[PDB]
Design a protein around this ligand. Structure first.
Ligand code: FE
Ligand code: FE
Lengths: 423, 423
């Protein structure tokens, strides 16, 4: 089957491009001087944008599809969400977890997402969801490379056998070590928990992704320990701080001091715009803070930052179709990244930057890489974002794994007219 | 003598009740269907409210009755108060302490208080006040069960031989181990001081009551260490955090996170409304914060909180008659617990909740308990509070130990009329 992608636009490049495929890899990328004809074994991008696959750097596949079960959250807070989740966690079964994880994973495949990092709550002696997710990881592997992050949701030091269970999760095969220092009983447990997390990541050679300062508390500064420990161990690339919503509330002087360390450390940041706008600012009356981390500033400083969906129809977020362009849309608005170039470059926040966060080794439209790429029916990132386009084709190992025939809208004026909303 | 209390109202109960007494204990409690006749050996509550005795969970009997000696405070701050007290402490004698402690204790007996926890400053190599108070404890025992809390007023780590003196105080018989982490030179001394306090309480099997975050500093969070250490040691019931006025100034997000630990830990909280309204907010100009801990929220969350008088005519508070209904009145206003039910249930804050704070084993109107109870000439808690009623009778071991013949007010209109201010 497929030998070429033709008539492709590429972000930050002029003109049209031909992507040659061989043995499941990209063999060569060649500029075109005009439109190429279609032929058998050519997939025509039709002057749409070709990008490496969307990435979901932060989702909770063990909580997905449980919104309102057994009860709703309600106050719309992180803290009530954890309480509601704890009630649902007591009701987990193996098949329950696999079915719900797979439901969301199919939406993700449909949405051109080929790389997903799922957190899985390991504050659970039975490790029910983890055992299920390890099977799901193997099952979905033809379509999605799933990383599993062992997430000690109720604390490492603040939950019975929390450290032991976290380590057990790694011994069972979790790819990433998690932590939640702002949810530990004390600041000292918070800091200690990070030492323990880093020690485990080094013992097992695993990545780190900390739920870090997800709280509107200007004194929640666990991020400095995450970055300092990464710098000390020389392991920045392998380390991620998720959320860091407290950073929205820091004074500017501390933030400036901190940013030097953040860039030196080389650690990654995940913002979760759909969830953060909902859960943050809940303790303000009016005015009410936005509560997303300092994405615009990170980008300006060359600090790697990217966007996750976080929860899809779960205890913290009742909405979602696991759509990364939608996540991006919310983040651009709330972060005021609304300049033409900022919007256009927005795709990086859900592609390349997220690949870096996942420490991916085979990602991007480049000769020698696996032929994993998606085609958006749009002229550039700005257009894709504005029109919230579907993924026309998703290609993995040089084979089509998803396609969307786009909607067709007609208005019946003096004559019928097709409406495509371009611009 | 006394065999029965008749015509008694009880909080949260309908109708009238008869309380049978035998051998200094309550033998039985029986509902009445109407008013019972008086007889010899019956004490007639006269459809007034019968409750277990008032409790003073936080007072400084070593500083009581010293207001303005040798100098006044003045700025009306915690910090100047400590300075003024230090000057008075240098002048203490054995008999001086006993006489002043006894003066306030008699006001307390008159006010139906049968349980008192006094702090005693043990930042004093001579332990003068402690030695006096240990004698007072034995002397007053027929009327008041006095707990002595060893209070390292000038710090454990920040005062010469502070830890040794604290331990000496326990060896001499103090019932409760104190601490003052926000007054230690550094945050690290604050945290360390709490480890040392818990270690002493476990070594000697004593209760803990920390002067905790009594400061308008949003960064004073020693309460999380007090609660975490209690939870770790499984000793919540035995532990109290006094004041926690900093909590008035916390952001809502941290407070929400903290509250989960506060409820899990099971520790007790004392607010001191008369003193807190006076000493807190002194560093604000306008607007000026109230500075009482989050009493309303604690009650809503089922966290045990109660009220103390703190200082009676002392270096921090020049007023007082050691009257718990007056303390309660101030707290209801400043905390905005002003709903009918909130006011009516206010008695719990100076009875049952305070008994829990003192870890009392024989408290409440229940069969088998000691016959320790007081009678208020009021229909319910709301009425008692509104009219600031005296204690008509105080009964201990089934014997009357105090009584008040109430004031009689007459207005001379066209005819004389008795005025009772009911409603
Ligand atoms: Fe998450
Ligand atoms: Fe005090």
């Amino acid at each position: 089957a497929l030998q070429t992608i033709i008539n492709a636009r590429l972000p930050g490049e002029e003109g049209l491009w031909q992507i040659h495929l061989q043995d499941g890899k990209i063999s060569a990328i060649d500029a075109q001087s005009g439109v190429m004809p279609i032929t058998e074994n050519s997939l025509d991008a039709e002057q749409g944008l070709v990008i490496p696959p969307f990435v979901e750097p932060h989702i909770h596949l063990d909580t997905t599809q449980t919104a309102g079960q057994p009860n709703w959250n309600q106050s719309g807070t992180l803290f009530e969400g954890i309480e509601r989740w704890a009630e649902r966690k007591a009701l987990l079964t193996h098949d329950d977890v696999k079915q719900r994880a797979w439901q969301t994973l199919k939406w993700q495949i449909a949405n051109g997402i080929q790389h997903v990092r799922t957190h899985v709550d390991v504050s659970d002696a039975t490790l029910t969801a983890l055992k299920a997710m390890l099977e799901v990881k193997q099952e979905v592997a033809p379509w999605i490379d799933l990383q599993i992050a062992a997430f000690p949701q109720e604390g490492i030091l603040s939950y019975p056998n929390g450290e032991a269970l976290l380590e057990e999760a790694l011994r069972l095969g979790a790819d990433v070590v998690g932590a939640i220092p702002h949810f530990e009983f004390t600041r000292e447990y918070g800091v200690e928990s990070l030492h323990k997390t880093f020690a485990l990541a080094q013992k097992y050679d695993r990545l780190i992704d900390v739920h870090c300062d997800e709280i509107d508390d200007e004194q929640s500064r666990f991020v400095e320990t995450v970055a300092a420990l990464a710098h000390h161990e020389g392991m920045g690339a392998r380390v991620t701080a998720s959320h860091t919503t407290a950073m929205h509330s820091y004074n500017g002087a501390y933030t400036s001091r901190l940013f030097r360390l953040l860039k030196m450390s080389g650690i990654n940041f995940v913002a979760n715009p759909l969830v953060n706008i909902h859960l943050q600012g809940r303790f303000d009356t009016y005015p009410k803070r936005r509560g997303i981390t300092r994405v615009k500033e990170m980008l300006e400083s060359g600090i790697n930052v990217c966007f996750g969906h976080d929860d899809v129809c779960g205890p913290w977020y009742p909405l979602g179709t696991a759509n990364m362009l939608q996540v991006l849309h919310m983040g651009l608005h709330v972060c005021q990244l609304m300049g033409y170039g900022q919007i256009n470059d927005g795709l990086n926040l859900i592609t390349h930057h997220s690949a870096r966060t996942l420490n991916l080794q085979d990602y991007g439209i480049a000769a020698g890489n696996s032929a994993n790429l998606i085609i958006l029916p749009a002229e550039n990132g700005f257009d894709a974002l504005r029109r919230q386009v579907p993924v026309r084709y998703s290609v993995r190992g040089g084979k089509v794994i998803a396609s969307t025939q786009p909607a067709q809208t007609t208005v019946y004026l003096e004559q019928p007219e097709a409406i495509d909303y371009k611009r």
